[PDB]
Amino acid sequence: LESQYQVGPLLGSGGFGSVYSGIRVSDNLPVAIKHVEKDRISDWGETRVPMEVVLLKKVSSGFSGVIRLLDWFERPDSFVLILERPEPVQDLFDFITERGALQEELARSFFWQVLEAVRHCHNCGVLHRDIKDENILIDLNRGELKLIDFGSGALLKDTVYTDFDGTRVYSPPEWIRYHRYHGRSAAVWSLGILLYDMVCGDIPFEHDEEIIRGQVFFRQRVSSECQHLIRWCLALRPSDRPTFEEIQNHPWMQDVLLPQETAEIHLH
Ligand SMILES: Fc1ccc(-c2nc3n(c2-c2ccncc2)CCS3)cc1
Numbered sequence: 429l430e431s432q433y434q435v436g437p438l439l440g441s442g443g444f445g446s447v448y449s450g451i452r453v454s455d456n457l458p459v460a461i462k463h464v465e466k467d468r469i470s471d472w473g474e475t476r477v478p479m480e481v482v483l484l485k486k487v488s489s490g491f492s493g494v495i496r497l498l499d500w501f502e503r504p505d506s507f508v509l510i511l512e513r514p515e516p517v518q519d520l521f522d523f524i525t526e527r528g529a530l531q532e533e534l535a536r537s538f539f540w541q542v543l544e545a546v547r548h549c550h551n552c553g554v555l556h557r558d559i560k561d562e563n564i565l566i567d568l569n570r571g572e573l574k575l576i577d578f579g580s581g582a583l584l585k586d587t588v589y590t591d592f593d594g595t596r597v598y599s600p601p602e603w604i605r606y607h608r609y610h611g612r613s614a615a616v617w618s619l620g621i622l623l624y625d626m627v628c629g630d631i632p633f634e635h636d637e638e639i640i641r642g643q644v645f646f647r648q649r650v651s652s653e654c655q656h657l658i659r660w661c662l663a664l665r666p667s668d669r670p671t672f673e674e675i676q677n678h679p680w681m682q683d684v685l686l687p688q689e690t691a692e693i694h695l696h
């Protein structure tokens with residue numbers, strides 16, 4: 429590990445562990461090196477590994493809008509994950525904080541890419557469970573978005589989930605009320621929160637009561653088409669929420685820019 433990778437500065441730390449910038453020695457490939465202590469691991473899978481490793485392996489085959497796991501290591505008291513690192517890069521949270529509410533053309537491109545990435549995970553049998561601005565990286569040169577942090581994820585199933593350790597303000601009312609949710613419909617809710625965040629520059633709900641009330645107020649000028657899509661994704665009844673197909677077939681989602689085109693217009 430220490431022979432294969434050259435460690436750089438700390439990028440961040442938190443519930444996910446500690447992430448360092450790094451370089452692969454063999455070919456100077458930019459990487460991210462994530463350390464997590466074993467006793468801080470709550471979810472295990474299978475060799476006994478963090479569920480995160482299991483999930484990442486399932487989604488890291490081939491190209492995608494997901495940050496890929498290149499390798500991993502077990503230490504006596506920790507696991508070390510080697511992940512892709514775009515450069516230059518900025519997470520969506522920082523980007524929005526910096527630039528404010530996004531133009532709908534830009535939000536369309538970003539949201540479309542997030543949808544394709546989430547579809548990839550689900551098709552690979554993986555549920556992310558923590559879709560939000562902080563867990564989305566922007567390749568600033570290519571205009572490509574990449575999903576990160578499967579640490580709260582789970583294998584995708586059609587039965588009910590009774591556990592959740594993702595972000596509460598992105599969590600659906602059925603979780604708040606009943607501690608029960610289904611994967612896809614819960615994902616769609618979080619995507620509704622995300623889309624609002626893109627076009628308004630902030631999330632629509634802070635309190636549990638606002639979430640379960642489900643009333644959406646717009647603080648920025650947002651097109652009626654976009655408002656409709658957001659409110660559809662944020663339907664109180666899970667079964668009233670759109671499928672991924674319905675979201676991507678929505679009138680607001682038409683004529684999306686290519687990632688490179690998005691970068692040239694909005695990022696370069
Ligand atoms: F180029 C990169 C920048 C951030 C990451 C990254 N990948 C993960 N986390 C972070 C991250 C790093 C720093 N601050 C916040 C999140 C958390 C769990 S998985 C990877 C590559």
Ligand SMILES: [Ca+2]
Nearest residue numbers: 560561625631
């Ligand atoms: Ca947010």
